[model samples]
Target chain A: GMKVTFLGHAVVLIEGKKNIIIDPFISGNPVCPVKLEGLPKIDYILVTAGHGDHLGDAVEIAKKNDATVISNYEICHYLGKKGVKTHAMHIGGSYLFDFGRVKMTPAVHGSGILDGDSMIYGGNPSGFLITIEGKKIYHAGDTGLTREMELLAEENVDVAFLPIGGNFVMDVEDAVRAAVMIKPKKVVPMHYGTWELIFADVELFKKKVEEKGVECVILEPGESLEL
Target chain B: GMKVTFLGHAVVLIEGKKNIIIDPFISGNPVCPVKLEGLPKIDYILVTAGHGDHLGDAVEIAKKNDATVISNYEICHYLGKKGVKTHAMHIGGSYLFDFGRVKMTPAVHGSGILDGDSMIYGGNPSGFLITIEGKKIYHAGDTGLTREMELLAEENVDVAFLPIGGNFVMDVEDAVRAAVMIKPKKVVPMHYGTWELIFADVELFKKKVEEKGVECVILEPGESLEL
Candidate 1:
């Protein structure tokens, strides 16, 4: 059995032989499901990009749990300087860790770390394909819809976490179209409703995604889906 | 004396405490000054972006010279997987190397590496500020004149390399205007004469820049300027 939990604002936790977390935005996340004190021992941490929301509490969590943080070269270096262990990877590359293989995919967005007035470079914004226990899971972190979805369909991914808010991320309609292209076994709608600006109706997304014959799972902030 | 070699099509080699090369396009360049065999042991290779002209011959040169590359994170990681050693830096960040201090300056442009059918991510296009041996040199890599140059002028720069062709870059007139604002001790013209569309009259640029009370240096391919 595999359990995947959505903790709001692009944060995800996966449980199997090895437990992993991605983009654990907790302290600053008003709508987050759990606080920093609630998580279990994380085996690995995957960060898609370096936005404050997406990269929230990563170093703190890594230091607390003795987890290895994985991200692009620049972000890892930025994290390494803080005395946390890091594994440096970049877009168009893949590496097999102790339990699974993770591939960095392309994302169409900006990648930067803001420090008051300075904008530090965060390498390239990216997505991730994690293959474990005979299942393929894709976490699209703050990604806009892209034609790359058509190519990703070849992977026959078991599930895909797609951001379905507009303005900065992809709208519900684009996420539906992306689901139609990738044809994942299941789709999870995310990255919305944390604020007034990014709110979208989940029923609208569920209806359209199902119309294309793909299962769209709408989970609450702390909900977990088992496979 | 600092010997700066103008090797055509944005290819510049600086000889001082550390020998450095920037945007070496000798492979595909028509007006190239020297072959790959002619260069000395280069200590550093600087690439502003991933365009073919700007990144040409870098891997080959780095392998031959065992040199370190300085660029945005995406380019450095791409080169790293290819087995070349690289130091990743990004726009708005500065690092001190063994021989000098280098800063990655921002430029408004597209960044990608075209390999076969896929155009790989190359992060942000950039300019560079290199301070070496009591002299400051600016390489405005494929950048149009910007108000940022006005900010850069406060550095008390000794030399500035500005591109002076239109089509896709700043024209001779804008280049002259950039010179007036930068107020560097001297200005050198580049990014022209490789094609018909992006060509400009160097003498016209020299005459206009001198009229504005700034010194302009025009070098033939393979010519060296001693500072």
Candidate 2:
């Protein structure tokens, strides 16, 4: 049995035989319920983008647990600069390591910050098809609805995490469409109602998905689920 | 005619036939009244720093609309490599592109993560002065009050977007002083009342700025004023 805990907005901790963290957008996020400093050791840290929310607390968690960071190509360099051991790959690439296999899938997204005169390493936006303990979990980082996501459903997924908020990413309706395409056994919704612009009633998402015969798990910021 | 619509908290939509979005923090923003994706096409995108609220929908909106992103050199490369066309530049440097002239100014603030990483871009905080279609807009991208703002005011800014929230950024009193120094014809308040620590009553900000005889527009999100 694996335990999945939602730390808020894309930060999920999966504890099985191996511990894995997915898109830790914690820290500096006032809305984030938990701090990276309070978190326990992790075996793997997976990031979908270099944006603060998705990449939040990853470097620290990886460093704390001596965990392997799975991210985009430039992200390794970005993490390495911070002294974290990272495994970097690009979209359309997959890595088969000891814990599980992860495929870096395409995501439509952007990254960066303003500095004196130099832009540092903000990495590509991506999603992950992670296989842990023979179960496939798809964690979609902050993104819009793209046809490429249909490819993710090509293979069966056990648990799928999708962003239902419409402000920067997809709205509930579009996310419902995405979940339909992904065809996962369980669909978990995230990244909504925290900020005003991304506000959506998750109950609506759950109802819509349920009407379509899909199981939806809408977790609170600190809630946990067993898989 | 190009229209500049403020979507609250440093997020602006510069609408020409081709729309340009700067810091789409509308979504998930509790103080905002709108969502990011529900808006129109975005042709150009700008991000000031690595904060979560600022970089809200740059990637999704940009990817959907084929928008060219202009941001810090690091953020530009990060987005560019993600298949988004981004022109990365640094602060203190001015770039005259088809959109117009943009100069990155200084911002005095902290950008550290709770996870103990220095998320600040090389320790050089920055604001932006963007000139388009003969109109100058000064976006004080999340900063504390400083003398450099007086110099920024020297740019003859027509409109200034200033943060009114206290604690993390400038408060009402300091922002009022900033408006006096900038002396822009129109001043707008942002970055307040979204979360607890960063919250401030815009009524106070309006009252203070009005006492100084400057025009203060404290708009709710989804509300807009034509300049």
Candidate 3:
């Protein structure tokens, strides 16, 4: 069993014996109430795409904890430019590194690390199915609702962090449908209400999921839950 | 009368009976919940800054609708490259376009249109005061709370959209003070709660302002109001 802390959006701080972070969009994000300086030290960082928000604070956290970053090849260059320790692979590839086993699964979204002219074009965004301490946790990094998720479900995920915001990501209704199809032992909702495009009513999602007899955990930015 | 639809963050869609669109960030905005295809045809576009969220869907909207764009000199050049109709102007400058009268007001913020190498240097952002049908509405394009806003208040603005999110922008408390200082007939709060850093209780802001006898309108995304 591990503890999952929702750091808002797709950023989840997962801890068992080893501390791991997935798709961390830290304090500098202009929409949340928390900041990176306000959190506990990270032991591992996982990045999904090149978007600034998803890749946020990874360099800061990685530097402080000397944590290894798990991401795609493009992110290797992106994070390397920031002087962070990065071990970048690509989607569909899995490897066992100092952090544990990580498989970069497919995601239906674009990835870029920069905002303007200096913007470097990273490859497509991706999700991760991580097996740590015999617990399989899936972090859907900033992706739209897609059928490809069905394949990941075949792996028998224990827990999943899914985005429910509608505009840029999946809306609550679609996320509910995905949760039903995935049939994970437990599902956590995230990546909504942090931005306008991703705004959603998690309460509604919880209610809907509960009616279906599925366990749903919706955490506020700083809140944590044990699994 | 113009319909100023708040599309989240600093994006607003101002439409005349014929057709005009201002700041089209309707799609792929990390902070918005709308899409461009869902919007009506546009004839005119106004961009106050070059931030990704602000300039979001600009090229697509302009090209799709054959709308003329109004923005800074640098942004004009950038858009010109994309073959959009652009009129470039500077701060303290006034322009008479077909839609109405527009005056660019000073803003203190960074304006770069790209991320790394391909980035275009868009100049500092400014506010837009559009006077049409003897009615004036001001759009404060992503600014920190400044005394210049107080100066714009002298225009007797009927409605004003200002950023109330902190860190990258102003927070709720500062926005309250701004409302008192600007003294618009009706104030619209934006840029907060869309992400983590910009969290605020719009209800709290409204409460503080109402106590001082000021009126504030806080609209969620996809909501509309006519004036």
Candidate 4:
């Protein structure tokens, strides 16, 4: 059994054989319920991209919790230079960790790491397909509708996290089409409602995806869903 | 002597021991002087990113001229799948080709391949540092100002191509700073005035860069500079 907890923003905690946190945008997220110190010991930190919201507390959390940071080659070097243990990968490349397998997939977006007043190069943005205990979870990170989602049907994903934020990412209409293509057992909406820039109606999203035959699960920040 | 020709847009043709073209967006560029067929035999095609303009004629040109393609891993895979010969590398990673050495460097930008009616994942965007005949040339592919330029001073680059378009890349103000930081012998401005969104004055850019003590070479669309 695996427990996938929605922390905030794109953050999702997977507890099974090994605990994993993906895109832990905690402190900065206005809606995030829990603090970083309150969470369980993290075994791995899977960063999808280098946005400040997505890369939130990655350096500190990985160091404090002794977790290996997994992301693109450039990002690994960015954090690796800061003394965090990292496993660098490229798009379409997969690595099997002790807990399970993680594949770095493509996502269409900019990845400039926000450092103080200047933005440094944060490598490329990516999505993650995490497989633990035979249960697969796909985190789409922050992206628009790409041809990639249509090809991911073969993965047999149980849960698919798609961004429904229209302006910066895929809106509900596009995500609904993506849900139909992926054919996941369940879908979770994220990367929206945090600010006005990405305003969207979750109920409208729910109706559209449910029509496509995949269960739409809306998790409140700090809520948990089991598989 | 190596002749570096400024084709329109970000395209630059290098005719040296082995002729190489970087980001050749010939057919699509409005300000370009030459057509694709009029070019000399190309030995290699260096794609800095996956944008249409940057990757223009990569597949067609490579297929027609039997030129090998060089870019980041994802882009290599994308074009390689189309039956083009490709050599994939990552950021900060250098590979020595038969003609010279190339080091893929960091660029802060997004790369979604704009296919007809759809956008596909185009891996990571990258700048390239090409070394031919013991002379280093840095192409700061479509990107904003990054701290990486400050570190490139040690590379002792001979010619540095910095984008002067502010909307999407480093504008004139930042490019001047970048030129000072890199301390290159010659500076070539690019990625500007192609569209109204990135409108900038080259003379103003040249004046500012000249003040930094680096010779600013403003080449016409088809003009060539011998090194």
lDDT of 2 by residue, B1-227 (tens): 67778776778878765577777776677766667657886778877875667766777778888888876545555566568888655444455666687666656653221113545332234577888887888888888987667655557788889998888789989999999888888888888867788888788888889888788877676677654
List candidate 4 stretches off by more than 4 Å: B1-227
Candidate 2 chain B, which ten residues in sequence have the lowest lDDT sum? B111-120
Error of 2 at A170 (Å): 0.8
Q: Residue A13 in candidate 1 has what lDDT?
A: 94
| Location of the lowest summed lDDT over 10 successive residues in candidate 3 chain B | B88-97
Give one digit per residue, the lDDT tens place, for model 4 in A100-214.
8787766778776777887665667888888888889999999988766664787889999999989989998999988888899999999887888987899999998998889
Candidate 1: lDDT of B74? 93
Q: Is the docking of candidate 1 incorrect, acceptable, medium or high quality?
A: incorrect
**lDDT at A99 for candidate 2?**
71
lDDT of 3 at A105: 85
For this target, which candidate reaches the highest TM-score against the unseen true structure? Answer: 1
lDDT of 3 by residue, B1-227 (tens): 66778777777777786465556767766667767787788877778778876777888888988878877655776788788987765444455566677766656576668745656557557677788777788888787777656656557888888788788877778777777777888888887766787788888888887786777888887676788
- What DockQ do you compute for every candidate structure? 0.03, 0.04, 0.02, 0.03
Model 3 regions lying over 4 Å from their true place: A30-33, A115-117, B1-227
Task: For residues A1-227, write the lDDT of model 1, one tens digit per residue.
Answer: 88999998899999988889998888989889788998888989999888988888998999998999988765776788789998866554555678887767667787776657777667667788898977999998898887655657878998899998888899999999889878999999988999999999889999989989899888888998976
Q: Is candidate 1 or candidate 2 better by lDDT?
A: 1
Clashing pairs in 4: none
Error of 1 at A164 (Å): 0.9
Q: Pick the candidate with the highest DockQ.
A: 2
